[PDB]
Amino acid sequence: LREAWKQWLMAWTAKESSQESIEGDTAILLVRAIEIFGGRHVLTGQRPDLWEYSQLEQLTSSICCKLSRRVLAQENGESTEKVEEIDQQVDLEMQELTRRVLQGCSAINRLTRETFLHVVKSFCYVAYCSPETIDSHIDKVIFQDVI
Amino acid sequence: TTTMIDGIRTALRSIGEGEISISAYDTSLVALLKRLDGGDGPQFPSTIDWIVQNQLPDGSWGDASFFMMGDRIMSTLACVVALKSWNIHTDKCERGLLFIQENMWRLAHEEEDWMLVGFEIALPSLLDMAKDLDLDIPYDEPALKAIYAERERKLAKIPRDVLHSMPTTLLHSLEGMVDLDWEKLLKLRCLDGSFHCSPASTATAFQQTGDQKCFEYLDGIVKKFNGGVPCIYPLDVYERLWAVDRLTRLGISRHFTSEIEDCLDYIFRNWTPDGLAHTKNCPVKDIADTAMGFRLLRLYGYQVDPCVLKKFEKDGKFFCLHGESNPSSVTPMYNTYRASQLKFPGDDGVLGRAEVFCRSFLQDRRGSNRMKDKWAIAKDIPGEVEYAMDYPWKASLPRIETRLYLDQYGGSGDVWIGKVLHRMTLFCNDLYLKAAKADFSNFQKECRVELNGLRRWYLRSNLEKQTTLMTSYFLASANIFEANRAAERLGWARVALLADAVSSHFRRIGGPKNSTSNLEELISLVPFDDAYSGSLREAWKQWLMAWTAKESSQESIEGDTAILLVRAIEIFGGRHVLTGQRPDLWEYSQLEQLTSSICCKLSRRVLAQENGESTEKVEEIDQQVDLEMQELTRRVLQGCSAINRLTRETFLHVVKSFCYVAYCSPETIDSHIDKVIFQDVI
Amino acid sequence: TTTMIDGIRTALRSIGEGEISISAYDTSLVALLKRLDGGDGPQFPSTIDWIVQNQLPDGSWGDASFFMMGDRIMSTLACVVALKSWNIHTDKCERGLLFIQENMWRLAHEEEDWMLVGFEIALPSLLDMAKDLDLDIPYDEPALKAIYAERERKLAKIPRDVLHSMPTTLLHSLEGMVDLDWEKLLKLRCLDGSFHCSPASTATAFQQTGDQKCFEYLDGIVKKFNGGVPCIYPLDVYERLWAVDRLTRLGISRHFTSEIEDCLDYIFRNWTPDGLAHTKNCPVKDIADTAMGFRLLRLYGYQVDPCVLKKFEKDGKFFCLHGESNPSSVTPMYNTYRASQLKFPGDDGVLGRAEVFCRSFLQDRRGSNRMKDKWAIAKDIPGEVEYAMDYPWKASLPRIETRLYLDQYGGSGDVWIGKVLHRMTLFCNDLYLKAAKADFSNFQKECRVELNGLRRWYLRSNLEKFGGTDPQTTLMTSYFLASANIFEANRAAERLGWARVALLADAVSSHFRRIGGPKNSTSNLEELISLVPFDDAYSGSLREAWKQWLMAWTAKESSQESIEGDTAILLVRAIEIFGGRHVLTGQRPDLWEYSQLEQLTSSICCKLSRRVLAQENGESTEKVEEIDQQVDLEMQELTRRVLQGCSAINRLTRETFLHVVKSFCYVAYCSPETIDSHIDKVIFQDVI
């Protein structure tokens, strides 16, 4: 966790004068922290696992960056077409990610791909809901007693 | 010849305080120091023996291999003022007097931008001390009132109070100074005990007060050379840095990978928070040494911080020294500019100001024929400034640079400018040129053979689904040019060729979904061994999948092509990330992502530039790729990680190849090609 | 290399009744047995068959390599007597008699300490046996009178009474006595059936009595060696002890940790309450085996009591055997002194008097030039004695003693004074020295390589802006003090760790000591621990130790106490981190053992720091001696707690505590020039 936080902070101080958002770095930090807390290494010896992990990380970073850009452009005084463009690109990247994750002939473990999917789905969910529905769901899931 | 390499290595690994020539001025000035006990003549006989031993045919002094004017007349007068003061060998004394009396008319045609150190403060004092003895002087001449005016300007810019509170560059020439008031000035000299490492000034100071440390220094420096005293001593930090520079720029650095480290060690052990001028003693750090040591240390994987360069900042202008009474030269500014490339994102903005101020400076003086420097004399400095200003670090392949420079090294004719004229022996030699030419010819012949060796296979492989073969092989050879890396070079080239072939085929057929044939089997055409049989096939399948997934979108597929080419380089050679950590995974992922992003951005830029849009979008994409390349360059040459060095240099090689492709014109590319791999040398 | 280790392991795993070279005198004295069944030839003809085919080219007998007078005299006289008795092969008797009558004159220059056992009781009787026959030997000699005088001098110490009641060291030479009460003498022999493990005495008693067990012993020892009888037999306890000692003190014992533990079990199973002996079934004991066996049994983690040494006391003056003439015994007193270092505080106080008397005697003998022993010559005894005396148990790193001991080994040049000069083979060999030298060189190579690597790491991290005015000496000292204890091949992750953390501590300490305390500091110091290369298991749990040490620094300011204790605690914790060794604190005794060990280490290091400080300022000797005793008490307690076997902790942890304390205690008992000589001799001085 020390190293992961150091890398995240270095990525902060390395993109201070650019117009690119920094949500991808936070997503990568969350994924690395979950993988560390779980206690699952990755066999870095053979090439296919390395390449699979690199592809997955690049995909989730790009997806989170696109989501951040869409969320920024939404509330601002923009038209209703650029939003559709960004949504189409987001959907293409998401379908590629779910192809890479839900497959069955891969060599990486099962839980790591599901962790990637959980993080990306959490981001995409929190990006697509007004706070009122979030409050309603919070009150209905862990507070509204069932039986 | 390989023996020359071992010879220069043996001469380098036994380095000392630098081997420079001897000056007549200094020998004459130190010869006239008389003894203490009795004193039946001067102190040292070796100096006067060398004086009477090394007369030129014209009767003058100095190195006649380059006929200057000022140094010759100064040395002759300062030598006669002693040869006729001790009243010995009188038959040759006036022989030099005739020379000066017949050639004093040249001081109205000599260059202004080449004036020796302390000239305007050592020539009047020389005339003063020569007044007494029986000898003829042409006192009245405008070329003397001129130097008097320069002396007055120097004394106007440099008051007297500076010579008693802080070290100052004046102490190198203490001859034309009176009423020194050595009470406070004696505790201000250097740590070795000298006076700014100038034997003449130490002799002048010891003549007026009996100090023992200056006596010991003079005795040691005269007994070291066994006859003769150099113009300046020692030179144990300047020589090392400049030798390492002139050695790594020629292209034989890979042979001496041990002595270079054991030579930069002595630089890193003396990185004072102020700087390093020429020794660990002289406390007058200038900006022509730092700009060199900092760049070199940061290039070979060390830990340095450029906040020290801020100490020369004065109102946007940069001082060469503390009291420069002259517009600075080009070599310190040129070195500052060349060291303002390896900037890291977290570094202070001091480099951001140098990168523009020095650019403006070197652009003004380049817009004319005013390219004369002040601290050096070389064959073609404007050409090298042109090269360093036309091609930045982002698109500077090593082979192109070494080829364009190999015909610009001064050999043995590079004189320098101090108090007298002197020549360097370590990094001004002809063995370097011989070894560099031999190695370059070997590489050229190897490439000229392997180019046809590759063209034959290309014609036999039936891949016409042209001219890209020669360019591809030139790009493959301009980076990995070592003797035993053909296995990686051919792999570099073949995968790129097959890739652009399939890329053209997919575009022609109209999509990768209307393809009726199978394509994964195409990898069998490339030669293979048993150890790496399917891994390359796996990478090829991954590239094909990345293509069929990145279709009907906007981002180009060139990034994945760069990543595939990198993995291909990685397969040939067989080195893993076998250590096994979390930082290793993270470093690999970050490097791959940065490479892909930079490649895609350059693809977008080259696509959007041809369209003829406004010139501002180009500036935007350029600033973006610069902000990315800074971080990539930081991660490549940090030298504090656990990844095999070549696996790290591969990414930089590929990214620089792509940047050079995107930042050049085809005709200039072809000129570089047929100048490097077609036109022979010698 | 590695086949030599296999040969040595094979020679060890099949040890038995002992290996020892044959001797001609005993064979001659055995051949004189006339046949039992009534024949004419001797009972054992293999003795003659051997004795006739082993004559030296010179025409003499005895040992070939070495050359001593009494050996040759006795061997040749016995051989000529055994030849003349049966009166066969009489062509060589004159060849031997020539040598005798030509070299008996030179019997006046032999040393006084080198006197064979039973010499003054076997030479006169053999001369009398020769006088019965007509053999012209120079019976007259000024030297022979000294022998007859020494005979009476020894006979005065043992009367005719105690020889028939208590078994003494006299039965080893019996043929040189007559008028024996054989009734009250058959009740004193060994359990095997031989008189004090001696074939000559058994032979003499057989031809003068009608016993049957002695005949069985003689027949067995004759048949086991296919002709020829040895000087003494068996040796089933001597060989084991001295082989284990020569393997331990040579630095090669780690490869044989599965046989040494199976070799010491035989000694532990036969721990006779009044001391050990030179075999399992000898009724007289001595000190050259009790002390050595006790020390060896205690150093490997057994349960032995040292009160058995009380039997060897007589008016505050020890001895080696029950009644002797010349008390010139260097090896027994030396071994007793060396076994007087291991000492628990609750043991009986006899070891104190043992140490005192042995040190007094050895210092007396070292003042003069009488460093000659009566049991065995060697290559260098004074070197061994001076080393074991000048560097006590507290400050004797094993690698140093091994590097020094790779010179004083005898190889094949050793010989032990018994009834005649006889060579031992199982622990006086040539494979031992060669294997030890090879292993030492193989260690030195890795030492040099890792030293270079550590030097590069020290240069790259700009950690020379602190430290003394000569960083190379500090680096060399702090790496030698680490590569001398953990010397194995697969513990680099602990060696280099110790070195790095020691350098960091010694830099931060100087930086703090040149400023004026922790309050006047401004830089971030907690971050210096990141200079150690990153890992997953090792790092991460080390910043805790660093922060605890820094809290210890910032908490001991208003007082005046030292800080070395917390530095030793940091070193032991950081050595425990690497290697990956936990302690199962689930059960309590392990927790309590760990706490006690840590507290003892801290206190000892603080007391040593106080000693060095109060000794530098030039005070009297009383304070220094008091501090020395105060330190030695806790050192004894720590040694007891580390060597014993009660709690259940991984032995390597307690051994790490011992290593750290040994280093911190050794660094304060030597001048810098001496430690520099040691660093130069251990690493750079190459072998073979």
Ligand SMILES: CC(C)=CCC/C(C)=C/CC/C(C)=C/CC/C(C)=C/COP(=O)(O)OP(=O)(O)O
């Ligand atoms: C800087 C490089 C590449 C090498 C160093 C070579 C050295 C040590 C040169 C001597 C340094 C020194 C004492 C320079 C003197 C600086 C000075 C104020 C000279 C006075 O002359 P200027 O004020 O430059 O004007 P002119 O030299 O044109 O008269």
Ligand SMILES: CC(C)=CCC/C(C)=C/CC/C(C)=C/CC/C(C)=C/COP(=O)(O)OP(=O)(O)O
């Ligand atoms: C027990 C140790 C340390 C070694 C054993 C090695 C052997 C074979 C020792 C001989 C065993 C033994 C019974 C020796 C006694 C021989 C003897 C002469 C006893 C009486 O005289 P000493 O006083 O021992 O010696 P001197 O005869 O030279 O006076």
